[PDB]
């Protein structure tokens, strides 16, 4: 299990994450029980489900 403060302490990376979901024109993905937010220059594939760009952690996996 992960907490919100544990996730927010992790660094932001530049790469690709799969199983990406939308939340009002904003993209989110789950990685190591932490939810990351897509920003920067985005390049998407796998029918909007795989996004490459800047991923910043926002919260923990529910």
Curated annotation (Swiss-Prot):
Q: Where in the cell is it found?
A: Virion; Host membrane
Which family is this sequence assigned to?
Belongs to the inovirus G3P protein family.
Quaternary state and partners of this protein?
A: Interacts with G6P; this interaction is required for proper integration of G3P and G6P into the virion. Interacts with G8P. Interacts with the tip of the host pilus. Interacts (via N-terminus) with host TolA.
Span list, region N1: 2-62
Task: Report the SS bond pairs.
Answer: 7-34
What is the name of this protein? Answer: Attachment protein G3P
Q: Which residues of the full protein are shown?
A: 17 to 78 of 460
Q: What is known of its domains?
A: Consists of 3 domains (N1/D1, N2/D2, and CT) separated by glycine-rich repeats and a C-terminal transmembrane segment. The N2 domain interacts with the I pilus, whereas the N1 domain forms a complex with the C-terminal domain of tolA. The pilus and TolA binding domains are independent of each other in stability and folding.
Function, as annotated, reads:
Plays essential roles both in the penetration of the viral genome into the bacterial host via pilus retraction and in the extrusion process. During the initial step of infection, G3P mediates adsorption of the phage to its primary receptor, the tip of host I-pilus. Attachment of the phage causes pilus retraction bringing the viral particle into close proximity of the host cell inner membrane. Subsequent interaction with the host entry receptors TolA and penetration of the viral DNA into the host cytoplasm.
């Amino acid at each position: 299990a992960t907490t919100d403060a544990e996730c927010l302490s992790k660094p932001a990376f530049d790469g690709t994450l799969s199983n990406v979901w939308k939340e009002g024109d904003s993209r989110y993905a789950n990685f190591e029980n932490c939810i990351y937010e897509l920003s920067g220059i985005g390049i998407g594939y796998d029918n909007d489900t795989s996004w490459n760009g800047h991923w910043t952690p926002v919260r923990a996996a529910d």
